[PDB]
Subunit: 46 residues, 7 copies
């Protein structure tokens, strides 16, 4: 309820403050996650 | 009763936010991506330390 | 009998919601995302 | 590989339901079950937190 | 290594005489079905 | 080095002379096949464990 | 906040490579798919060995 709407409202405030389009934020975070996942996989394999 | 009741409950919560559904999805996806990056960094330091401890005391 | 019966069962349940299938999928995706965020916060701060 | 694909094709064709509907319906069922698993894991993490406090 | 792996998968897929997008869709349906079974067993246990 | 990693992947993909979207699709099919095998193995293990837990417990 | 800082950090690294963002994403996806196939093969041999050990002991 207020836990869900308050959480969404908080994320919206933070994203708006960056002045970066939301689709760019998502793409850039996806690239960082992919890079870290590749590092973790290499470590696990060795 | 359980599946349809669950969907009806989520719909009530989402409608009360007065935020477009695709925005709610995008914002939660961004928060999840950020937290997953933090967890991956913790797991990487933890694997490196665990491997070193196994070497030093094994 | 196993696969077709499973599909037929899910179809009956979804139809009984009286909500378009793509809305059911979207709403369940939002609930899953919210719960996954809570779990990640607990794992990181504990 | 080819035998596996041919088998899945036979089963899906026998349902007389469009392939994209089969995929969507199975995805909805999986999402519902994953929400239940997440709720169980969250009560489990809360219990683990309480046990750390008590002992 | 990488190119040899890709060339091998291409040979196997071509031998099925099934469009690549259908192979992907059918394997996705099989995986979804098995994942549902695994989730049901984990939830009761 | 992030840029070095990207440049390395680009060199390997270019050398295959296969469109990037085909490389991605073919690797996705191979991954899906192996994941199905792993799920079948896990399900036989869980099924056996369930039966045993019921019979003796 | 911390995400504004994280976003600019990733942008700084990606811009330095002078490769379009969608290419960076695609190339990293291909590398991840390749490594995931290798990990799945290792997990499958481990599950097979674990099954044999349960039989022997």
């Amino acid at each position: 309820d207020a836990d869900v709407c308050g959480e969404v409202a908080y994320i919206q405030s933070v994203v708006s403050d960056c002045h970066v389009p939301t689709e760019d934020v998502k793409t850039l975070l996806e690239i960082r996650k992919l890079f870290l996942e590749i590092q973790k996989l290499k470590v696990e394999l060795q």
